[PDB]
């Protein structure tokens, strides 16, 4: 039965790591601050940013985080419509600790 389904989850995880490592993931998405881009949080492209890659065996993976998982919130501030270079700066603030909420999407 090939109709069209999604599994729009929304897991929240807790992350920490030694200065001798990193959360283990590649963050990708549109910059902003002064955008001309589209802001339609439709059930298609959840947020500007997303995990393009997650290192197998590293922190982010050891907390369920996987490739494709869109970044919804970094600690507190809702980052769904926040620019890359901004969501990043945030992520760092929390030094070796990072609270994040993202969402999986299966087809």
């Amino acid at each position: 039965g090939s109709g069209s389904d999604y599994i729009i989850k929304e897991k929240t995880v807790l992350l920490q790591k030694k200065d001798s490592e990193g959360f283990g993931f590649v963050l990708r998405g549109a910059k902003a601050q002064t955008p001309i881009e589209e802001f339609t949080p439709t059930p298609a492209f959840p947020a500007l940013q997303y995990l393009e890659s997650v290192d197998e065996g590293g922190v982010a993976w050891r907390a369920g985080l996987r490739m494709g998982d869109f970044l919804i919130e970094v600690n507190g501030q809702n980052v769904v419509k926040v620019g890359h270079r901004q969501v990043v700066n945030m992520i760092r603030q929390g030094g070796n600790t990072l609270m994040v909420k993202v969402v999986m999407v299966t087809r």
């Binding site: 990193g22 959360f23 283990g24 993931f25 590649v26 963050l27 990708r28 998405g29 549109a30 910059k31 881009e37 393009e52 890359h84 270079r85 990043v88 992520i91 760092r92």
Partner: protein, 61 residues
């Protein structure tokens, strides 16, 4: 009508109105063709703006 000239004339009259139409169609086609060529240029143009300054960024964390 019943003479070679009177009819040769009413024929061309006919022929000419046809060529008039083929033209209004012709002119309309280039127009569309043009608006379609210029939109492909906008794609190409924006494919370029992104080749240069991406808007899509990547960061290792």
């Amino acid at each position: 009508m019943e003479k070679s000239l009177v009819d040769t004339v009413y024929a061309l009259k006919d022929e000419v109105q046809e060529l008039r139409q083929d033209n209004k169609k012709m002119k309309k086609s280039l127009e569309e063709e043009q608006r379609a060529r210029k939109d492909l240029e906008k794609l190409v143009r924006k494919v370029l703006k992104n080749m240069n300054d991406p808007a899509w960024d990547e960061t290792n964390l």
